[PDB]
Design a protein around this ligand. Sequence first.
Ligand code: 82G
Length: 358
Amino acid sequence: FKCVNSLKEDHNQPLFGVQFNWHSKEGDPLVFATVGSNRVTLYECHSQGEIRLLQSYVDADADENFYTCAWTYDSNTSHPLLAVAGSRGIIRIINPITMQCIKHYVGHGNAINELKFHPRDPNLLLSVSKDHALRLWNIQTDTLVAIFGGVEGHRDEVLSADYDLLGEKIMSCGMDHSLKLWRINSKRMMNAIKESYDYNPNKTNRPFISQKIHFPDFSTRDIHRNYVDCVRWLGDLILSKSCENAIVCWKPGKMEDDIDKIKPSESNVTILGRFDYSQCDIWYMRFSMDFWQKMLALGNQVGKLYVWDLEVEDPHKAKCTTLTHHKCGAAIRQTSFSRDSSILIAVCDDASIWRWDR
Ligand SMILES: CN(C)[C@H]1CN([C@H]2CCc3cccc(F)c32)C[C@@H]1c1cn(C)c2ccccc12
């Protein structure tokens, strides 16, 4: 990777999120979204390092602060869609062509820290909240499918979550130091999703009933000793980080325990490796993977990038490379690889954007 360009957004506030559109069409340029201040902005990547500015959505509320974005597509038309959310606790579904807000969702109106789309169903949107809960939405029928909470759920802000390969289960994490597993392939949850698709408020009298899921299928506080701010599945394994200069690769149970045989009472975890780095000991820093999960990237609080090659026989054998530029000195909150892994974008606390090409 070589640094080919940079720019800075005019608001001078942190860029909290960046996402390439992995649903961009054949023959079209690569496009990414950034979120920070009260805005979302789209850019196109072009030759000779060009980062072409397109158009923003700016929230009507000057005090909104967007924290997260995620791409999907319209399941009927195929056109890409962009979901954004943050401090106001309002999910906005944005038409990226025109930057129009198509529709919006409110749960209880508390800050949303992350959004994720289901890997198999483009209508299923997961939000994680300052109010300690996760929420699963069906953005086709505009229904709240389930709330994941209760006293056995998270006890402080939820900071991150991720679906596994097939979207059968979710791992969440947050300020309570815990990582929690929630199965969504239970008979109850499969039925709830089916019912959400059958719901049309114009054709019935009932409100749509959301599931209240009050018991995770696994929980641990044994991986990290501070706020857990990023989690991703790697097959049946988990990658997660806190502010302790480490991404830990771990699994529930003992070494030979099948993820799908793990009981809610499971008291053990197995550590398969740990990727250490430097100067990333502030809260709220995300790592990202490429589409194929061959590579892992994380920025630190002084503008350095770490990239791990995961194409090795066991997690602890990952090969690290580092990327620095003398002008890039601000904290990198998130990175995003293009779908083909040819471009890596980093976004920063000073509203700067850095493009690395290979
Ligand atoms: C808990 N919350 C106070 C945080 C969470 N953070 C989201 C976006 C980035 C991120 C990364 C990993 C987990 C995350 F949850 C988040 C937004 C919020 C925030 C509000 N300001 C004013 C901040 C200033 C600096 C850093 C974070 C913030």
